[PDB]
Amino acid sequence: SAPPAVTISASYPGADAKTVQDTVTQVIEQNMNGIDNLMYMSSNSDSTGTVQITLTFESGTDADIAQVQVQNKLQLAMPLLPQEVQQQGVSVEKSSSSFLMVVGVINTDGTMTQEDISDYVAANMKDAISRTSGVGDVQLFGSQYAMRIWMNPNELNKFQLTPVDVITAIKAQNAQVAAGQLGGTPPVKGQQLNASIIAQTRLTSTEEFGKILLKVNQDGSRVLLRDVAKIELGGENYDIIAEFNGQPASGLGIKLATGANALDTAAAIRAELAKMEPFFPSGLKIVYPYDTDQGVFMTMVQLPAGATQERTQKVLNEVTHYYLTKEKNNVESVFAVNGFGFAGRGQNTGIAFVSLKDWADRPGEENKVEAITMRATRAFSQIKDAMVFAFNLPAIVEATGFDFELIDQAGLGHEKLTQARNQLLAEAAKHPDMLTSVRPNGLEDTPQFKIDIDQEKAQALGVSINDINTTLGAAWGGSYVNDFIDRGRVKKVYVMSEAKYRMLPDDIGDWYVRAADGQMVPFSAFSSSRWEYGSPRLERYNGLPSMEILGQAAPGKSTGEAMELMEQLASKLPTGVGYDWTGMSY
Amino acid sequence: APPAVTISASYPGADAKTVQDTVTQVIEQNMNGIDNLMYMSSNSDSTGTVQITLTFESGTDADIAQVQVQNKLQLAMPLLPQEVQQQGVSVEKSSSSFLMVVGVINTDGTMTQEDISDYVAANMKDAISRTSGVGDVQLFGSQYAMRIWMNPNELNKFQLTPVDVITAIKAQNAQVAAGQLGGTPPVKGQQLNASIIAQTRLTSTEEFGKILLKVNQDGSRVLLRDVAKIELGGENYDIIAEFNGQPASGLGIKLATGANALDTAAAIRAELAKMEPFFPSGLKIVYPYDTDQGVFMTMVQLPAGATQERTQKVLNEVTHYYLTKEKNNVESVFAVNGFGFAGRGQNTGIAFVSLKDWADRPGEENKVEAITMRATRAFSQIKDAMVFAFNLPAITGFDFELIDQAGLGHEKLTQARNQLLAEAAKHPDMLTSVRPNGLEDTPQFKIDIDQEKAQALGVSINDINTTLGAAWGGSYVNDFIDRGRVKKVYVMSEAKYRMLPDDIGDWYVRAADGQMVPFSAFSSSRWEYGSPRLERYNGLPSMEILGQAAPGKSTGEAMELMEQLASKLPTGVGYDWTGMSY
Amino acid sequence: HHGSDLGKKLLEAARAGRDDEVRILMANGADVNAADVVGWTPLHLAAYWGHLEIVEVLLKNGADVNAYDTLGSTPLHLAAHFGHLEIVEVLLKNGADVNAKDDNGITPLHLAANRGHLEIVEVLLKYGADVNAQDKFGKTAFDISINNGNEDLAEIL
Amino acid sequence: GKKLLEAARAGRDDEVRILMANGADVNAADVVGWTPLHLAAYWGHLEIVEVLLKNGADVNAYDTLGSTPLHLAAHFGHLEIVEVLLKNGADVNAKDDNGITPLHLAANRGHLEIVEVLLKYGADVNAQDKFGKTAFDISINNGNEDLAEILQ
Numbered sequence A: 001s002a003p004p005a006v007t008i009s010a011s012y013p014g015a016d017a018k019t020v021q022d023t024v025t026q027v028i029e030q031n032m033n034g035i036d037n038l039m040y041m042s043s044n045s046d047s048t049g050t051v052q053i054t055l056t057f058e059s060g061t062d063a064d065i066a067q068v069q070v071q072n073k074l075q076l077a078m079p080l081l082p083q084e085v086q087q088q089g090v091s092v093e094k095s096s097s098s099f100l101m102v103v104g105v106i107n108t109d110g111t112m113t114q115e116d117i118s119d120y121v122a123a124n125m126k127d128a129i130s131r132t133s134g135v136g137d138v139q140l141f142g143s144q145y146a147m148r149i150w151m152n153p154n155e156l157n158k159f160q161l162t163p164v165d166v167i168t169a170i171k172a173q174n175a176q177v178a179a180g181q182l183g184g185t186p187p188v189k190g191q192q193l194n195a196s197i198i199a200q201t202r203l204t205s206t207e208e209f210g211k212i213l214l215k216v217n218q219d220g221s222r223v224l225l226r227d228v229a230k231i232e233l234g235g236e237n238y239d240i241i242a243e244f245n246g247q248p249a250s251g252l253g254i255k256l257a258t259g260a261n262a263l264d265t266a267a268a269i270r271a272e273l274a275k276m277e278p279f280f281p282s283g284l285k286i287v288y289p290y291d292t293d294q295g296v297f298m299t300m301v302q303l304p305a306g307a308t309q310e311r312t313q314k315v316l317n318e319v320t321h322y323y324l325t326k327e328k329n330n331v332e333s334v335f336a337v338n339g340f341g342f343a344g345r346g347q348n349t350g351i352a353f354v355s356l357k358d359w360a361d362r363p364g365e366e367n368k369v370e371a372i373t374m375r376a377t378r379a380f381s382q383i384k385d386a387m388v389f390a391f392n393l394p395a396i397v398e399a400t401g402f403d404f405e406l407i408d409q410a411g412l413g414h415e416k417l418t419q420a421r422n423q424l425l426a427e428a429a430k431h432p433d434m435l436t437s438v439r440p441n442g443l444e445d446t447p448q449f450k451i452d453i454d455q456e457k458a459q460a461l462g463v464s465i466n467d468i469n470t471t472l473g474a475a476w477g478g479s480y481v482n483d484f485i486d487r488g489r490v491k492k493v494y495v496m497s498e499a500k501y502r503m504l505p506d507d508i509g510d511w512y513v514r515a516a517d518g519q520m521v522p523f524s525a526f527s528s529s530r531w532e533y534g535s536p537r538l539e540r541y542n543g544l545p546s547m548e549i550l551g552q553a554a555p556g557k558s559t560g561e562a563m564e565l566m567e568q569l570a571s572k573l574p575t576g577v578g579y580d581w582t583g584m585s586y
Numbered sequence B: 001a002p003p004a005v006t007i008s009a010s011y012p013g014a015d016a017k018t019v020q021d022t023v024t025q026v027i028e029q030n031m032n033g034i035d036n037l038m039y040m041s042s043n044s045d046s047t048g049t050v051q052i053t054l055t056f057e058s059g060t061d062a063d064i065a066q067v068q069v070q071n072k073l074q075l076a077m078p079l080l081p082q083e084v085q086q087q088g089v090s091v092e093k094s095s096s097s098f099l100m101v102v103g104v105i106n107t108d109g110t111m112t113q114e115d116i117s118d119y120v121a122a123n124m125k126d127a128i129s130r131t132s133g134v135g136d137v138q139l140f141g142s143q144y145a146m147r148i149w150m151n152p153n154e155l156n157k158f159q160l161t162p163v164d165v166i167t168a169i170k171a172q173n174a175q176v177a178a179g180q181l182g183g184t185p186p187v188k189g190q191q192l193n194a195s196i197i198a199q200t201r202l203t204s205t206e207e208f209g210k211i212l213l214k215v216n217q218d219g220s221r222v223l224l225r226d227v228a229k230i231e232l233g234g235e236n237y238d239i240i241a242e243f244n245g246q247p248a249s250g251l252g253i254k255l256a257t258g259a260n261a262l263d264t265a266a267a268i269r270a271e272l273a274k275m276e277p278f279f280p281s282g283l284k285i286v287y288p289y290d291t292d293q294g295v296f297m298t299m300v301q302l303p304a305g306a307t308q309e310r311t312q313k314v315l316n317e318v319t320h321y322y323l324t325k326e327k328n329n330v331e332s333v334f335a336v337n338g339f340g341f342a343g344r345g346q347n348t349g350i351a352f353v354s355l356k357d358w359a360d361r362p363g364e365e366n367k368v369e370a371i372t373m374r375a376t377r378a379f380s381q382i383k384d385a386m387v388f389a390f391n392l393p394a395i396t397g398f399d400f401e402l403i404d405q406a407g408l409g410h411e412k413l414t415q416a417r418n419q420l421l422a423e424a425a426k427h428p429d430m431l432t433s434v435r436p437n438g439l440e441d442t443p444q445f446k447i448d449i450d451q452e453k454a455q456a457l458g459v460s461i462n463d464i465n466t467t468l469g470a471a472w473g474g475s476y477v478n479d480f481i482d483r484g485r486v487k488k489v490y491v492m493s494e495a496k497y498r499m500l501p502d503d504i505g506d507w508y509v510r511a512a513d514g515q516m517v518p519f520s521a522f523s524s525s526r527w528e529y530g531s532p533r534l535e536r537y538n539g540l541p542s543m544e545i546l547g548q549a550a551p552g553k554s555t556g557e558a559m560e561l562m563e564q565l566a567s568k569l570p571t572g573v574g575y576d577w578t579g580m581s582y
Numbered sequence C: 001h002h003g004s005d006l007g008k009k010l011l012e013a014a015r016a017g018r019d020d021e022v023r024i025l026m027a028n029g030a031d032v033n034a035a036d037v038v039g040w041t042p043l044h045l046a047a048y049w050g051h052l053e054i055v056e057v058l059l060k061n062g063a064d065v066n067a068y069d070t071l072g073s074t075p076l077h078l079a080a081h082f083g084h085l086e087i088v089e090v091l092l093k094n095g096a097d098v099n100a101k102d103d104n105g106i107t108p109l110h111l112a113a114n115r116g117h118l119e120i121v122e123v124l125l126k127y128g129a130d131v132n133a134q135d136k137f138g139k140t141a142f143d144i145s146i147n148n149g150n151e152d153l154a155e156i157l
Numbered sequence D: 001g002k003k004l005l006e007a008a009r010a011g012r013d014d015e016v017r018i019l020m021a022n023g024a025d026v027n028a029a030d031v032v033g034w035t036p037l038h039l040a041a042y043w044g045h046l047e048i049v050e051v052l053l054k055n056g057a058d059v060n061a062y063d064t065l066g067s068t069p070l071h072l073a074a075h076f077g078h079l080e081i082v083e084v085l086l087k088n089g090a091d092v093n094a095k096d097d098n099g100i101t102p103l104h105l106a107a108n109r110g111h112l113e114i115v116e117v118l119l120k121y122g123a124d125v126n127a128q129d130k131f132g133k134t135a136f137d138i139s140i141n142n143g144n145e146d147l148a149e150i151l152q
């Protein structure tokens, strides 16, 4: 029944929502031509540097054909995208297919972080799982290790070095070079020796990265990378924190291959997991946090704007604690995910996946999914400075609401589109007899730190703007430099400031850039900053700026009557503001 | 009809040989391993454009053919110049003829031709291009870019070059990823999380005007507006259209191979209905070409070398004839200068003619067939321009290819072509109108950089060729945001400093020692002849030749003579039948 | 006063321009000078988003007219920067520091001149804005006009 | 003597002793100048190292770049083989074309057990290579605290 959909996903590490939209999203959307059977296209670009573009096709469209046509158009547009985006990979996959099952991985010994667990799943479990019969796509809940170079601006200023020098040295000294052969063809006739020449090879350990030579002081002393940075194996990304009943977790999201049997594949996965368990290191255990009443439900967590990951974790821990105590008789597991929810991603969002005991062992109406989620939601209404909501998602997705798109049709811009949305939402509230819960599906503008580089001061001091923007980006956003070999497996190398030097506006002053003459110049010499509001999540519909609006028809009114009202209110919005229906309302 | 997949790419400022030798040959050499390919043909133009047509066997799935071509082109993309990759290459599976033309005018006359073209490109083209069944969309106009029109006198005065301008634009029209306050992984106890916003794309001529090029040693500032005029203007200026003499733009839409012509047109009309309520005041959609027929076309081809101004004069007389002599039969004329029935150039044009209702054109002399032939006869008295009117649905003599089989080269292939053309003229009883389908060589300006003098002065040859190409050909620098939409930024000489050979000497390049060196100090130039359009067939240099059997003679008989005529051509010259003759 | 929950709701009310919740909240004793994480008061938010009436009701209930955020910016900075002429006047009428400098030495005159708000530049000068005030880079409002190529603003200054 | 080069490499003790019982050259070399003693010390075949030295193998044989079988054994952590070579008269201070001694190769790989045996046999702790580096500089550059103090 559901129309086929293809989703394009891309990543710009360290980029804001506007940067993502204007260098990636718009460029990709402008190249989505010549594709058959397209109904509509929608996208969002957010402050985690992520863009998703969903293309929805007419019913009966071959999803394989749709995916191939979309991916081919995307690949021809690949040279138009930033290098940092190309290096992360831009995936094009059939969507609107939930997981066949979710496999969680924990360590009962408490000796492994979630990064340690994710790297074990990536290097020892995921590939054999994806080769299991009936298995289609497999998503890793985390990443394999990356070599993390955590920079110290105080040490770098001491030896007159910048992150530019660190990145240059790593590219030069973590390198794998083609070096030719002795006696290669064409040779001198009579040659006997034929041997490959081996020069530099990729580094393999924190120790080898630590002795990368940055500079030799003129008094004879050496500055090694370990003198300006802490070096450890870690994650490629730290936006998501996963816990299973409070313990660190990773895992796999497994999708069923097209035309394969669901339960046959589920048994094959479990049988493959049974093979691996003898080889697990001590403590590693497989769990199943969501055996899809239904026996499972979700809990939403949303914190105010600007709220940090640590604050979201506190609320999620309270949610986990409530279910494992106040519902210890009904709940078997809570899988808490800090970093995304339904309304988008970010440090102030989270979602908990709750699996219940067997329905047979939960007698009574009070121990069923609906009654459990009502007590939970009522108990969580106490929690201050957080919106916490429990629900069974099949029960909530199931026929009374509409899906509205407000569209900028004349280049008005985000601020003027926000005003038009506010005017429509204010009017929708004036008709409670017909429209209830008319709300934006997206996020509101939040404060952001706007730093202006003074071009005249940088040129007068001899400071390159590219050194300035590389220093700022690499230290505060992080940078994928190149690859290394971890126990025989190729993995990524990331440079970024140690956390304590990239937390607050005053930390901007700790960072120095080297000028043409050799002096170290602080950021305060050529920059100024102020607070301003901006979007953490920009939306587009059919290639134009948009804002999605959800709502319900009032009790005693039809879905068509409610839509009719919305159209009437929309007709009196400012000039250049249009609308369209999508999803359930298309 | 056998399905055809078309590859298109563009190289701003490149000549035909440059396009052929850095793009066309590279793509052709990597079109291997594709199923059911009948033949392959290509044009490389001095507009900087390449079009490669891959024709497949009848019954081939057009979806499969397109995907296989796209995948092979993807693997060859790293072999193409970066300047070509960044323009975007297109691969399409559409008919060669237009299904319909969507015309856009401003009834209030408050928008110029270029204003209308940008509106169409920025607000209409993309949604039409995504409509199912639309195989190709031609914009009869150009989208706005941010145009930096450089002045070589002021650049020299401040000892700057186009290299300095390009470097400053990339540095100061940038979109910076700068991370977050309290980003992950954070310290414990962190309370604030916020995006850091650094530089963002410029959005206006004023912002580009204050790009800071240099600070003089006394303290004064040299801004970009001090060495250039800054304005919105088309990415190129080669295509201008008119609707009944009035400024216009529009979209030429071609039907995707296998799509339904009627269903596609209705979907296009429904998409246009969504856009109309948000048009600026005065903007109106007209429909000048919807596929008796009720419509027809007229093509205009001037000799290679003709300017846009001279082609416009010929289009004016074509339009004038339909608007006066055929008053009672013609509803509208949509005329496009710079776009031709085959290809693109300053010396070609096309006019789409729409007839009044069939009921208002009674009599056999007022039907499409009688009108088009009367027009062809009237236009046959036009001096130095091929002009004729014809028909073409949304979905004949012979078609002959002369092929360079032994690396003979362009000059020798031209000579063999002329030798065969003169022999066919000596058989008027069998062959008629044996002519080349392509273009003739034209004078080009050959400039030679003296490597010794450049090195003796310390002038980098990269600075020289960048200065030459950016000034006289234009350079795509990077992107900006125009009213919320990503568009291009171009640098190029202001028109009056790139018109005449003497202007070459007004451009200065900075040497290593900081001295400015004029182009005359390290270059010399002469006139020579070269091709404005190079053709290839199945990967080899080629020249298409058209013709027809004489009256009272069969097509197979005419083709028999052409084969015998070709067998007596110089060594290494082959041939092949294509198209209708395949 | 209650605890600290009404202050946060006054910030969101003033940010979202709801004259309704704002007067109800201060009738219940909400902290009129409650600040958010970046140090913005309800007067900051109302001045930024141009809600003239909320600025009025806030000021009569004792809102600090010269409060600064964590980077030294006052509500007059915001109002002048984004062209809210009516708010600029009522702020100056209520004693807003016309020569307030943020952490970068940027004055309301610099911000108003940079975005070309001529009417606001005139109002600021009327209340005694220093025409020769320089920011951290030595630039005056006149230098800003010259760099932007705004000769009508340059003529006033 | 090629079959013995192959035999000393693949680690087949029985074949090897057939070859000197048949008189194969104990000092045969391949194109890179590696004797069977080199091959046995590289892949760590102790028994063949003992047998070859028993049949008069050059304990100080050089390859085309001046490396001895002691260099290979010290480099790749073969403590049993560095002992057997040093008792048979391996130049503990042997330099290759780059001035690299077995103490350098042992210190770089952190083979502290082999470093002690090398020192015990008279290894010059202050020996430099062409770049002037000693075994102590290697320990400092690698961060090996224990190895650093064994060289004082």
Ligand SMILES: C[C@H]1c2cccc(O)c2C(=O)C2=C(O)[C@]3(O)C(=O)C(C(N)=O)=C(O)[C@@H](N(C)C)[C@@H]3[C@@H](O)[C@@H]21
Residues within 6 Å of the ligand: A096, A097, A098, A099, A102, A141, A251, A253, A289, A290, A335, A341, A342, A351, A353
């Ligand atoms: C990562 C998934 C997960 C991880 C660990 C334990 C779990 O129980 C899950 C899920 O069940 C998820 C879903 O059910 C999704 O709804 C889910 O399956 C899904 C999907 N396949 O489209 C989503 O779109 C997600 N939605 C936005 C909330 C969500 C998944 O993110 C998670």
Ligand SMILES: C[C@H]1c2cccc(O)c2C(=O)C2=C(O)[C@]3(O)C(=O)C(C(N)=O)=C(O)[C@@H](N(C)C)[C@@H]3[C@@H](O)[C@@H]21
Residues within 6 Å of the ligand: A011, A139, A140, A141, A142, A143, A236, A237, A238, A239, A240, A241, A242, A249, A250, A337
């Ligand atoms: C889907 C994410 C997820 C879902 C549910 C539970 C989880 O614990 C996660 C993650 O931790 C992910 C990451 O950490 C990513 O590294 C992650 O966060 C991420 C990103 N933010 O760009 C990626 O690039 C991902 N990639 C595989 C390295 C990866 C994510 O795919 C997952």
